[PDB]
Design an enzyme around this catalytic site. Structure first.
Site, PDB file in Angstrom:
ATOM      1  N   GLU A   1     -41.470   6.872  -3.146  1.00  0.00           N
ATOM      2  CA  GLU A   1     -41.217   7.708  -4.300  1.00  0.00           C
ATOM      3  C   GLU A   1     -42.009   7.306  -5.545  1.00  0.00           C
ATOM      4  O   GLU A   1     -42.516   8.164  -6.258  1.00  0.00           O
ATOM      5  CB  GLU A   1     -39.714   7.730  -4.627  1.00  0.00           C
ATOM      6  CG  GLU A   1     -39.352   8.613  -5.843  1.00  0.00           C
ATOM      7  CD  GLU A   1     -39.636  10.113  -5.621  1.00  0.00           C
ATOM      8  OE1 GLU A   1     -38.853  10.787  -4.872  1.00  0.00           O
ATOM      9  OE2 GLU A   1     -40.644  10.604  -6.214  1.00  0.00           O
TER      10      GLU A   1
ATOM     11  N   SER B   1     -31.185   6.044 -11.851  1.00  0.00           N
ATOM     12  CA  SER B   1     -29.956   5.262 -11.983  1.00  0.00           C
ATOM     13  C   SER B   1     -30.205   3.945 -12.732  1.00  0.00           C
ATOM     14  O   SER B   1     -29.367   3.532 -13.566  1.00  0.00           O
ATOM     15  CB  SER B   1     -29.267   5.020 -10.610  1.00  0.00           C
ATOM     16  OG  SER B   1     -29.924   3.980  -9.865  1.00  0.00           O
TER      17      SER B   1
HETATM   18  C1  LIG Z   1     -30.442 -10.693 -11.570  1.00  0.00           C
HETATM   19  C2  LIG Z   1     -30.675  -9.198 -11.724  1.00  0.00           C
HETATM   20  O1  LIG Z   1     -30.383  -8.298 -10.677  1.00  0.00           O
HETATM   21  S1  LIG Z   1     -31.367  -8.537 -13.193  1.00  0.00           S
HETATM   22  C3  LIG Z   1     -31.545  -6.852 -12.641  1.00  0.00           C
HETATM   23  C4  LIG Z   1     -32.985  -6.624 -12.136  1.00  0.00           C
HETATM   24  N1  LIG Z   1     -33.057  -5.294 -11.535  1.00  0.00           N
HETATM   25  C5  LIG Z   1     -34.129  -4.483 -11.554  1.00  0.00           C
HETATM   26  O2  LIG Z   1     -35.170  -4.766 -12.125  1.00  0.00           O
HETATM   27  C6  LIG Z   1     -34.019  -3.139 -10.864  1.00  0.00           C
HETATM   28  C7  LIG Z   1     -33.696  -2.039 -11.869  1.00  0.00           C
HETATM   29  N2  LIG Z   1     -33.668  -0.756 -11.131  1.00  0.00           N
HETATM   30  C8  LIG Z   1     -34.734  -0.086 -10.662  1.00  0.00           C
HETATM   31  O3  LIG Z   1     -35.888  -0.473 -10.785  1.00  0.00           O
HETATM   32  C9  LIG Z   1     -34.469   1.199  -9.968  1.00  0.00           C
HETATM   33  O4  LIG Z   1     -33.076   1.457 -10.154  1.00  0.00           O
HETATM   34  C10 LIG Z   1     -34.833   1.222  -8.459  1.00  0.00           C
HETATM   35  C11 LIG Z   1     -36.352   1.311  -8.313  1.00  0.00           C
HETATM   36  C12 LIG Z   1     -34.281  -0.012  -7.731  1.00  0.00           C
HETATM   37  C13 LIG Z   1     -34.226   2.498  -7.838  1.00  0.00           C
HETATM   38  O5  LIG Z   1     -34.779   3.627  -8.541  1.00  0.00           O
HETATM   39  P1  LIG Z   1     -33.831   4.727  -9.237  1.00  0.00           P
HETATM   40  O6  LIG Z   1     -34.669   5.585 -10.137  1.00  0.00           O
HETATM   41  O7  LIG Z   1     -32.658   4.052  -9.831  1.00  0.00           O
HETATM   42  O8  LIG Z   1     -33.286   5.465  -7.909  1.00  0.00           O
HETATM   43  P2  LIG Z   1     -32.319   6.747  -7.935  1.00  0.00           P
HETATM   44  O9  LIG Z   1     -31.458   6.623  -6.716  1.00  0.00           O
HETATM   45  O10 LIG Z   1     -31.794   7.085  -9.289  1.00  0.00           O
HETATM   46  O11 LIG Z   1     -33.370   7.907  -7.504  1.00  0.00           O
HETATM   47  C14 LIG Z   1     -34.436   8.389  -8.349  1.00  0.00           C
HETATM   48  C15 LIG Z   1     -35.500   9.141  -7.515  1.00  0.00           C
HETATM   49  O12 LIG Z   1     -36.018   8.292  -6.476  1.00  0.00           O
HETATM   50  C16 LIG Z   1     -35.746   8.866  -5.187  1.00  0.00           C
HETATM   51  N3  LIG Z   1     -35.199   7.916  -4.187  1.00  0.00           N
HETATM   52  C17 LIG Z   1     -33.990   7.300  -4.211  1.00  0.00           C
HETATM   53  N4  LIG Z   1     -33.855   6.547  -3.088  1.00  0.00           N
HETATM   54  C18 LIG Z   1     -34.977   6.700  -2.364  1.00  0.00           C
HETATM   55  C19 LIG Z   1     -35.383   6.185  -1.144  1.00  0.00           C
HETATM   56  N5  LIG Z   1     -34.559   5.351  -0.450  1.00  0.00           N
HETATM   57  N6  LIG Z   1     -36.599   6.552  -0.672  1.00  0.00           N
HETATM   58  C20 LIG Z   1     -37.424   7.394  -1.353  1.00  0.00           C
HETATM   59  N7  LIG Z   1     -37.056   7.919  -2.528  1.00  0.00           N
HETATM   60  C21 LIG Z   1     -35.826   7.578  -3.048  1.00  0.00           C
HETATM   61  C22 LIG Z   1     -34.687   9.950  -5.402  1.00  0.00           C
HETATM   62  O13 LIG Z   1     -34.705  10.991  -4.387  1.00  0.00           O
HETATM   63  C23 LIG Z   1     -34.957  10.405  -6.831  1.00  0.00           C
HETATM   64  O14 LIG Z   1     -35.962  11.423  -6.788  1.00  0.00           O
HETATM   65  P3  LIG Z   1     -36.341  12.411  -8.023  1.00  0.00           P
HETATM   66  O15 LIG Z   1     -36.925  11.504  -9.084  1.00  0.00           O
HETATM   67  O16 LIG Z   1     -37.360  13.368  -7.454  1.00  0.00           O
HETATM   68  O17 LIG Z   1     -35.011  13.074  -8.378  1.00  0.00           O
END
Ligand SMILES: CC(=O)SCCNC(=O)CCNC(=O)[C@H](O)C(C)(C)COP(=O)(O)OP(=O)(O)OC[C@H]1O[C@@H](n2cnc3c(N)ncnc32)[C@H](O)[C@@H]1OP(=O)(O)O
Ligand SMILES: CC(=O)SCCNC(=O)CCNC(=O)[C@H](O)C(C)(C)COP(=O)(O)OP(=O)(O)OC[C@H]1O[C@@H](n2cnc3c(N)ncnc32)[C@H](O)[C@@H]1OP(=O)(O)O
EC number: 2.7.1.33
Lengths: 351, 354
Positions: B124, B178
């Site tokens: 994605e 998210s």
């Molecule tokens: C110690 C600690 O943990 S500190 C915290 C550190 N954490 C981080 O840095 C991670 C922060 N989070 C992120 O980077 C992101 O949330 C991610 C990359 C993990 C996930 O991405 P998100 O944008 O949240 O995923 P979300 O489920 O909301 O989906 C957004 C889009 O991606 C797509 N998507 C979701 N899951 C998948 C998948 N499994 N495969 C392909 N595409 C997907 C969706 O279909 C959606 O599509 P759209 O934009 O066309 O509507």
């Protein structure tokens, strides 16, 4: 540049508690000074009548004089008694003016008889007190420590850290909000940035989400909870790690992210929500601090503030977070005399 | 390299909706290709049965050397097997062997592709990046694909204005779903995820649902639009009576998000709308700061915001514009793209087998 009155003390007047630092000289030649010392001891025993004793710094040299630096805390309710005790025991420093820092200082000068307050800035006092205490060491032992094996909070152990030359230094001050100071020398520091997501956000949100009535209770709830019941993890989205970008499955993808599902919200406990709030806040602070450390080109990051004063849990999560974001390149540093730097800074500003 | 198939399309398969882009060639010499164009139109009309997307149509662009129009549609995942069957019945060679799709729902769909199509799953974020860079390169029918909000420090009054992003590189892309991922893009084939934040749209919706009992992202945003965050947040003025002069903080700056909620009196009078607004402000203010710090560390001065957090009300965009303007002291402008939502689908089109 030695204070005019005696005895020498510094105070940090909070809404609830006063933090007081005072100097007990040990080379005494006059009857009057011997009774000053005895009066200070009696005053200390009274004000701390219901750990700080163990913070006492022995045989340090302050303004050319040898003595012991003491640290006490007492209710702001009893600060009038401290002042009167000073007047009755003929302390030259409790007559002319009162120089204090802290959020309760102006208020106190209104509550309180005849008294003129000279108000000092908390962040300026914090930095001066911190640098001084670091410069004298903790009775020949480490004033500064970190948590070894920070990536495992159930298993990390406190270890001494050498901060003998403190410059440059990043000070991450966590109260209701967060201020970050870059300290280049005693006379050269500035607030480089901050975040409004601090201990007040933790407590505010916990109150709203769980109905807790204090910082202490919120942290106790958090200590028992599981944040992964509220948080959406990388594994919840990808079925494991996000390979392409090397995000591990256990990383948090979205804080409170599982709470968008009615069924998850129905089964989540108060304790899980408290822990998720704490983890969200400490992971976020570790990220801001790491990026500041990179931009400022400073690899020593010290954490202070009232957020750290209750459970060691706050500190261990901050250690974990800084280690995570720095990929092990930075250790969160902490200081034993945390909570007294304002009082010490106020004492040093006496002259 | 040009795709082997005809016709060219790409899909982003979500949990509930599919976003599809397809290319309608303008210069047709063969009757079978003319019949293919007529099929796609009939397919599009069926799938979108039962106008924003029509207005997104990009007209007379060049894709892989060919003049054409790029169309964008959305339709239920429930009707995806029909679409596949339609393509197979109309003899589309791009539905003969393998289907390359992105989206969180693509794997669930796998069994229907009843049939001899292999699913080749595309990433994605890789699709988003390829899609975004291509759409910026062609423009919006001349018009600007990219926009910012002028007077961003006043969200009540800020104005959507075109931004010329012809030479994109380098670019910081802040993707807000998210959670938040931040990509530093140096050229078309050299980008990386430089950091992220777990405080994203899911945090906003999750906390809102807990705090206010709202049932949807749309409802939480509606609530936030009516609320006053300063009822829940503690400002610098609340601590110092006004400005905190000595350390460069104005009285109106937020000292502590939700910080007034430590007071029972304040908790009992705060509205759901104020709580929703404070949640939203907290998240947008924080993303602004992370984005700004990343921009400075990566030395990039163009920061674009994308992702589903942006797709429901203009409010979240204006608040991000506001936050980035604040942290950069007006030196960075938050950028947005008209075809946000479809970049996944376009990147998948670009990833057709060749
Ligand atoms: C110690 C600690 O943990 S500190 C915290 C550190 N954490 C981080 O840095 C991670 C922060 N989070 C992120 O980077 C992101 O949330 C991610 C990359 C993990 C996930 O991405 P998100 O944008 O949240 O995923 P979300 O489920 O909301 O989906 C957004 C889009 O991606 C797509 N998507 C979701 N899951 C998948 C998948 N499994 N495969 C392909 N595409 C997907 C969706 O279909 C959606 O599509 P759209 O934009 O066309 O509507
Ligand atoms: C667009 C946007 O708004 S994005 C948000 C941008 N905002 C920011 O960057 C601000 C982030 N926040 C901060 O920097 C901090 O919250 C500050 C500096 C404003 C306030 O500091 P805080 O640490 O939150 O103050 P808090 O009220 O918790 O008090 C903490 C300490 O300061 C002292 N203090 C509080 N008020 C005062 C005062 N008026 N005078 C002197 N001392 C004070 C307290 O007594 C306490 O002392 P202690 O640690 O010795 O016990």
């Amino acid at each position: 540049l030695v204070p005019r009155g005696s005895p020498w003390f510094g105070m940090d007047i909070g809404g609830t508690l006063v933090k007081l630092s005072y100097f007990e000289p040990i080379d005494i030649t006059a009857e009057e000074e011997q009774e000053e010392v005895e009066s200070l001891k009696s005053i200390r025993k009274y004000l701390t009548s219901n750990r700080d004793v163990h913070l006492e710094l022995k045989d340090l040299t302050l303004f050319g004089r040898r003595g012991n630096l003491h640290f006490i805390r007492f209710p702001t309710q009893d600060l009038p008694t401290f002042i009167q005790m000073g007047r009755d025991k003929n302390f030259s420093t409790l007559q002319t003016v009162l120089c204090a820092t802290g959020g309760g200082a102006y208020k106190f000068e209104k509550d309180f008889g005849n008294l003129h307050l000279h108000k000092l800035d908390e962040l300026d006092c914090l930095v001066k007190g911190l640098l001084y205490i670091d410069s004298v060491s903790f009775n020949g032992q480490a004033e500064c420590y970190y948590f070894a094996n920070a990536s495992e909070p159930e298993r990390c152990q406190k270890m001494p850290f050498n901060l003998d030359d403190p410059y440059p230094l990043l000070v991450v001050n966590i109260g209701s909000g967060v201020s970050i100071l870059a300290v280049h020398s005693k006379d050269n520091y500035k607030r480089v940035t901050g975040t409004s997501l601090g201990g007040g956000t933790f407590l505010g949100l916990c109150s709203l989400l769980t109905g807790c009535e204090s910082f202490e209770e919120a942290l106790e709830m958090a200590s028992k909870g599981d944040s992964t019941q509220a948080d959406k993890l990388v594994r919840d989205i990808y079925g494991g790690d996000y390979e392409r970008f090397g995000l591990p499955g256990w990383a948090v993808a979205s804080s409170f992210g599982n709470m968008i599902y009615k069924e998850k919200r129905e089964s989540v406990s108060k304790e899980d929500l408290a822990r998720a709030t704490l983890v969200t806040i400490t992971n976020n602070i570790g990220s801001v601090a790491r990026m500041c450390a990179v931009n400022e080109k400073i690899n020593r990051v010290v954490f202070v503030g009232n957020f750290l004063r209750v459970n060691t849990l706050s500190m261990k999560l901050l250690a974990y977070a800084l280690d995570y974001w720095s990929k092990g390149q930075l250790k969160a540093l902490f200081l034993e005399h945390e909570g007294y730097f304002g009082a010490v800074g106020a004492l040093l500003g006496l002259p």
